[PDB]
Design a protein around this ligand. Structure first.
Ligand SMILES: CCn1c(=O)cc(SCC(=O)N2CC[NH+](C3CCCCC3)CC2)c2ccccc21
Ligand code: NA
Ligand code: NA
Length: 125
């Protein structure tokens, strides 16, 4: 069974639109989204479809780029660091559940190195 996906809206969470958060959506996420290795990360892990029954036994804080994309579009974040943390959680989950050398890890590594190149310089507020 899959758990409920992470929330993409929360009316009592404080929000704001910063230049950096707009950059994370327009530049950083759109670039990673078009990558050849992006498809496994574009939606929450379906433990039933992918035949990964132990996934949510191991991963207690799931995250994916589809959730991040909706969070950015719905103005869910307070600052860019909250969004960067969601990216880091998505990558760390992949390295926790899988092992070095796996195809999915090679994909995550390629996206993480691209992610670091794009956020090395953010716009100023
Ligand atoms: C980034 C999320 N994610 C994964 O972490 C792993 C995978 S594939 C992991 C995989 O193929 N495994 C990992 C689990 N493994 C066994 C599954 C049965 C329990 C014992 C472990 C079977 C082979 C993945 C695939 C599609 C989309 C997302 C995926
Ligand atoms: Na691991
Ligand atoms: Na940049």
């Amino acid at each position: 069974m899959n758990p409920p996906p992470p929330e993409t809206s929360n009316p009592n969470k404080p929000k704001r639109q910063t230049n950096q958060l707009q950059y994370l959506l327009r530049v950083v996420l759109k670039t990673l989204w078009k990558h050849q290795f992006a498809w496994p990360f574009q939606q929450p892990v379906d433990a039933v479809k992918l035949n990964l029954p132990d996934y949510y036994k191991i991963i207690k804080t799931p995250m994916d780029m589809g959730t991040i994309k909706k969070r950015l579009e719905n103005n869910y974040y307070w600052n860019a660091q909250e969004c960067i943390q969601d990216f880091n959680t998505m990558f760390t989950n992949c390295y926790i559940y899988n092992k070095p050398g796996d195809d999915i890890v090679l994909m995550a590594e390629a996206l993480e190195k691209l992610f670091l190149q794009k956020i090395n310089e953010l716009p100023t507020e």
